[PDB]
Each structure stands twice: as structure tokens, then as C-alpha cells.
Symmetry: C3
Subunit: 326 residues, 3 copies
């Protein structure tokens, strides 16, 4: 039981961690020139082979675990996935002039991430004291598959009832790169035994390859946050606040499992930081071929530029301190 | 001494191994769409740097071993390499209408592989009980270099004595990518001491990079097995049977070294699965620039689609059970 | 205390080491054809992510070390960096017809390397007996940053006072690829704590990725040493001698820190082989956009073809024997 004095010394040392240090280490070079560029072939084998580590981890956790205890955490994740896009359909919409709903339901892409909460939460979760379950990454496909289709279906059915009337929807999204690269991980995690290729090639160079992909995402965010000044003054305010308010409606909704079906308080924090995350890798390859009328800076510049630096900044050392309070 | 009841429980658990699980895990996504694609630059640094692990392994095994015991296994491998293409020149040729000999001697490309028998046999050989020698991968350059030139020389001299007359042959094949990438491994394995770069970069990420290359080979095999319906009904029958019959003429011919030398009975099985393999990586970069009039689906669709799934399916758990019978 | 008899048995076994063995293993295949080629996307993610290991190593060595003992080795490195280009402005210039000074001050690019002296000296330094300090790679940014700008500024101010008059200079060089990839390593080595991504992804596959990059550099050196016959007969003589004479003016100038500072005698040798090195990776991306009138074979063919094979050939086993004499 320790105050906000313990918070500030965590935030300095968690900004100093090697995942976010390259992100703000890529912004600071892009403000200085830097003709450095990683080619497009490397940045599409880092998008694969880093969404296969998450599929294999979630797939291996379903074999060696009972399917009794993993009902309440996944029914509080599907419901927690669908709820986020409807809140943003009521929160961010009823606003001044930037209320282009198809560029606003996609701004509620806030599903789950790879860059944090699988390598940021889990490496500071068991760094200090507290332990968690085996199915950390098994809550990644849930709240990512349902949280993106409801962005598509809502923003597609809203367009037909206004401009035209003045399975094939989910099929083009799920059949695509960086989302069939994850379902290949689950089917080979549930059915087969890849314990010699996961631990040895996909698992040791996972934390390292994330730092290359948070260098691309850092220095392609310097111009895109400057181009965001053209769009609005309200996507900034939604970006600083909604990664906070999506945690507390998940932290209390995750506080039902504790007083019902296990789900250790050390696991609730690995459910509440997942829901405040703003997808980066599974996100923009979808929601662009699914929703073409997109304005592709409102939902990317609010997730990779302001979204995840606050999602690793002021809410993972927050909910560790909330977990240490109990 | 245990019956076919022990065979079926091996085949289920050997189809569940992480090498063939991605192959039939790449077919099953390609039947479902999957805009996923690994770019051409990555799939030509996986072809190199996986034929350098085999060159370094065969090259290191020749230094720390006597050149007395490695004469009968390599004279029963060169002879076993040249014999396969002549059998197919007599077996598959005297047939109905698909007997285009230049698309048939290349269908006898059945040399040695990387994808199995170096990572499929050797990881199930010493998985259970039985031990083998040090020169497992030193039988890879033999029965691969002579088994491809005799595909070229026979199908080139047959064309000149029929259409035109109605060293420079082997030089264009051996001087090419994915075959000079292997001789670079041998010359740096015999002469130099790369024990700090092999074990540390080429050896730990060998089993992992094979699973990316058996994902390309899996989802480029869905259309190519459907295009094979245009060609014939006889390249299928040669594909299901010749990886069985090339083993027993190698298992008994390897049974002359166990009763005269000592490459041991656990080594004979790592000679008989090598000869029933249907090359995948050294194969099609050769036999295309060497033999242009090729019809490049008859010899690739019979080796990477039907050839190697039977070569890991029903003949590596077979000859382990034959070895456990003795 | 042991004679030149111990030298020859080192040179045979140090030519047999896996760094230079691929270099002369890439020349010997390029004299034989070899359609093998590593694509341009791979050879620009090996140039990055191998100049980030050197930035992180130098950056981590400045945190956990006092800034008292690292003044005399870096003031004997900046001065040793600027002196080399002025010697070559007086040695190589006053010559017959090939004295094109802008193709001659760049021929004095002899700063520091990655391919040797970080993986060639340091892996034979602590191989036998002798120990060195912690800041081996922290002498890489020094004598590389000042040694290239003085190649640019001298050869730019010489052109203006002869053809035209018959910060923005260093800015275009330092703001570029393969040199901002190193300053990203230092700023993330001094300020942050990347001890979980360095040791695990950048450090284990450093020695291996150097052998791919000394395979490109080996087989792109066969034609370029033949094209060097067109240029001169004097860039050869400067290439065989100046990696020897730059060591002894550094070995005695490093012998002032052994009798006035803590810089040990085992560290002097890791200062004197650094100054006889002829840059390969940070070199030619600079000095080409900085100095366009370059004749880009005089300064590359003298550094990657004759420069570094003598810089690993006859001067790292030399100065180990000089260090073992004392």
C-alpha cells in the first residue's frame, strides 16, 4: 500500500524499457533527417512471424488448460471487445464538424495489441512479484477478431441506410495478411505440437523483432501526427483519455471473475491493459480493405502516435499500482 | 519386436511434428483464400543459409572422421544416386501418352532433400533410442550432385540423337544459386574452422527457417496439384509408390555395410530415407536452366506436393520400425 | 618472449577463423561463376542491425564506467583519427599522374571498422590470455565520426580554392543511413536500459550476420580489384603498407596511456588495431554523397579488397605478439 510517489519512479523506469525506448527513439531521429529506411520486404516478414508467436502462444495455452476456467474471462472479453466500438459510436460521434462516422467508427479500432500488453505488461508483470495464469496470449484472438468486424459491419450498414437507401462482410477481413497469419498460429497451436520450433525460433527473437517494428512505427509517426493537425482537435482528446477510461470499465468488469471463477487478481491486470491498447499490426491491414472510405490518418495517427505511447505510458504502471493496492 | 499397431500411433504423432505440420498447414489456408505472401527477397535468403548449414555439417564431418569407414557408404550412395534416374527412364517412360521423356527424366529428380531426412529423420532417429554416426549430412552432397547431372546428361543426349541428329553440361548446373551455396559450405567445412558461426547462427535457426520454407512450398502447392490434373494420371501413381520402392532397394543395399563395416544399423536408416526423398530446394533451380524443355509442373508437382508428404508420411515411421525389428 | 616462429602459426590459424574465411571464400567462388546473389533488401538490414550492436555496446560502456579514465584514450583517438587523413594528404598526394586529390583524400578513409577489430581482435584478444577493458567498442564512434568529416571538409575546401575561386558540411554526412543507425545505438545505450534486447537479439546474431556481409564484400571484390588495374600502380602500395605504419604510430602513441592512465597494455592493442582498419560499412555510404567527384573504386577497392585482408592478415597477429613481448 504505497502512494503516487511509487508511480512516478515506475514511469521513468518504464519509459526506459527497450520497447517504448525505440518508439520515441524513432521520433527523435525523424525530426533530425535520417535517410535510414528499412525496406518493405523486411517489414512484411516482421508483421508475419510476430503474429505467429501470438497465435502459437494462445494455441498452446488451450491444450494444457481446462475449458472450465476460461469461460468467464473470454465472455468478459468478447463483450468487452464489442462494447468499445459502440461507446465510440456514441462518445466521439455527437461532436462538431469532424463527425465523419466512417472515419470515426474506425477510430474506435481499440482492440488488442502486440507491441504492448504481450511484451510490455507481461515483462513487467512477473518482473516484480505478482504472478498470472497460463493463458495471457490466449486473450489476444478474442477481443481482436470481434472488435474489428463490429467496426466494419456497423460502418458498412450505416452507409447503406444513408447513401444507397437514402458472412461476406467478415470474410474479406479475416481472409487477409496479418490476420490469417494469426489463425495459422492457433490451428498449429491447438492441434499439433510445435514445441521445438516455437521455443527456439519464434520465441527468442520475438522481443528483438518488436523493436525493429517499433522503429518503423516511430519514424512514420512524425509526419502523421503533424498531418493530424489538419483533421481535428478532438481526435487528440479521445486519444489521451480513452486508453484510461477503457481500463477502469474493464478492471471492475474483470473484478467479477475474481469473486466467482478464479482468475487471479494478477490476471485481471492482464485483462485490463489489453482493453486499452489501440491495435497497430492487425489493425490497419484490416479496416482499409474492409472500410475503404476511411481517411487513413484519423484512425492510425490516433493509435500509433498518441494511442500506444499513453497505453504504455500512464496505464500499465497505473494498473500495476492498482493491483498492488489490493 | 512390435507390429503395425505401433506404426499407426507413430504416423499420427509424426504428422503432428512441426515440419510437416506447416506444409499441410499451408495447403489448408490456401484453400481458404489467404492474401498472405512472403516476399521474394526473403525466400532467396532462406534458400541460401539453409543450404549452408548442410554444407557446413557435411564439411565438418569429414575433418573429424577417418577416410576408411566412409568409402562403402558413399560408393553405395553415388551408385544409389545414378540408379534412380535410370530406373525412372525404364519405369515411367514405357507408358501411354504422357511419355515426354524430357518431362520424365526430370520427374526422376529423386536425389536428397533438406526438408526431410536432415530434420525429419535425424530428429526422430535420436528421439527414441537408436544412435547413428557423425556423417549424417555428409551423405547429402553425394547422391545430390551425381543424381541431378545424370538427369541432365541423359535428357540432353536423348534430344540430340532424335531432333538434331534425326564438362560444359555439368558446368551450368553446378555454377548456379542453391548449389554453389552448398559447395561454399563444404570448402569452409573441410578447410577452415567455423565452429563459432555454425553453432550460433546457422545451426539454431535452421529448424525454424525450414518452417517458413515449408509454408511457401505448402501454399504454392494447392494450385499446382490442381494443374497436375491436366498433365496425366500416371505421375500420381509414380509419386505414391516410388518413395516406397526406392527405400527397400536402398535398405537391402545398405545392409551390405552393416555386415562388412560399422556405419551401423542406425545409420542404414539414415541412408534409406535419404534415397526416397524427391529434392525441393536444390532441385528446381537446377533442371530448369539445364533442361529448358521441361514442362515445369510434372517434376515439381510430383515432388513437393505428393512426393515429400509421402516421404515423411509413410516411410520414415516405416524404416524406423524396420530398424526396431532387428 | 617468443620469436617470429610463433607468428606464422598464428597467421595460418587466424586466416582459418570464420570472419576472413568467408571473405576469401567469396572471392574464390566469384572467380568460378556463381549466379548466387543476396538481394538488396537483405544487405540493407545487415548494414543496419550490425551498426546498432556497435552503438549499443559503446553506449552501454559509458554508463557503467567512470569518465575519468576515458579521457586520454579518446583524446588519443580523435587526434589519431584526424591525423590519418592529413598524412595521406602528404604521403599519397605528391606522386605521379594518379594524384587526383579528391580521389586521394577519400583513399584516406582509414577510420574504424566493424568487420575486424570488434569481432576479429576482440575474439582473439581474450581467446588466449590477455584481458582488456570494458570500453572496447566505445572507441568505435570516436575515430570514425571525426575521421570521415575531415576527409570531406579538406577535399571540399580544396576544390573551392581551385575551381570556383581559380555545420552544413558535416550535416549531410551524419544525417544518412549507416551513420544515424549508429547514433541511434549510442543514445539508446547512454540513456535507456536495453539489456534485454541487446543480449538476445542484437548480440547473438552479430557474428553470424557479419559473415553474410563479408560474403557480399568478397564476391563484389573480384571485379573491383581487376578494375583497379585501370586506375594506378600506387594505390596498391599504399594499401599494403599503410595498415602497418598506422599501427606503430598508434602503438607508441598508445604507450603514453600505459604510463599515465589505467588503459592497460591489453587495451593498447585494442587501440592500435582499430587505427589500421580501412572502414567498410560506415565508409562508402558517406564520402559519396559528401564527396561526389569521387572515382568510386580508388577508395573502395583499396579498403575492402586489399585494405582489410591485410588488416586482419599481418597486423592483428603482429600486435598480439608485440603485446606478448612486454
Amino acid at each position: 500500500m504505497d502512494f503516487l510517489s511509487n508511480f512516478l519512479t515506475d514511469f521513468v523506469g518504464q519509459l526506459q524499457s527497450p520497447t517504448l525506448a525505440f518508439l520515441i527513439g524513432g521520433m527523435v531521429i525523424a525530426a533530425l533527417g535520417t535517410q535510414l529506411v528499412i525496406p518493405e520486404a523486411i517489414s512484411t516478414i516482421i508483421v508475419f512471424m510476430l503474429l505467429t508467436k501470438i497465435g502459437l502462444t494462445g494455441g498452446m495455452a488451450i491444450r494444457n488448460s481446462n475449458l472450465t476456467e476460461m469461460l468467464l474471462p473470454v465472455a468478459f472479453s468478447v463483450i468487452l471487445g464489442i462494447l468499445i466500438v459502440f461507446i465510440a459510436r456514441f462518445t466521439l460521434a455527437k461532436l462538431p464538424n469532424v463527425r465523419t462516422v466512417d472515419a470515426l467508427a474506425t477510430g474506435g479500432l481499440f482492440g488488442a495489441v502486440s507491441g504492448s500488453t504481450m511484451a510490455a505488461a507481461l515483462t513487467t508483470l512477473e518482473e516484480s512479484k505478482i504472478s498470472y495464469e497460463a493463458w495471457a496470449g490466449a486473450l489476444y484472438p478474442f477481443m481482436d477478431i470481434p472488435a474489428l468486424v463490429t467496426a466494419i459491419v456497423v460502418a458498412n450498414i450505416y452507409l447503406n441506410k444513408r447513401k444507397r437507401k437514402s458472412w461476406p462482410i467478415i470474410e474479406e477481413s479475416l481472409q487477409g495478411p496479418a490476420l490469417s497469419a494469426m489463425l495459422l498460429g492457433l490451428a498449429l497451436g491447438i492441434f499439433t505440437k510445435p514445441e521445438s520450433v516455437y521455443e527456439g525460433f519464434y520465441d527468442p527473437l520475438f522481443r528483438g523483432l518488436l523493436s525493429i517494428l517499433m522503429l518503423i512505427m516511430g519514424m512514420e509517426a512524425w509526419s502523421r501526427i503533424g498531418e493530424l493537425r489538419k483533421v481535428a482537435q478532438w481526435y487528440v482528446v479521445y486519444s489521451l483519455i480513452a486508453p484510461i477510461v477503457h481500463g477502469f470499465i474493464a478492471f471492475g468488469l474483470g473484478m467479477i471473475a475474481h469473486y466467482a471463477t478464479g482468475f487471479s487478481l494478477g490476471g485481471v491486470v492482464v485483462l485490463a491493459v489489453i482493453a486499452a491498447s489501440s491495435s497497430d499490426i492487425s489493425g490497419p491491414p484490416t479496416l482499409r480493405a474492409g472500410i475503404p472510405s476511411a481517411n487513413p490518418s484519423a484512425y492510425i495517427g490516433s493509435s500509433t502516435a498518441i494511442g500506444t505511447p499513453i497505453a504504455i505510458g500512464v496505464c500499465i504502471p497505473l494498473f500495476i499500482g492498482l493491483a498492488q493496492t489490493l
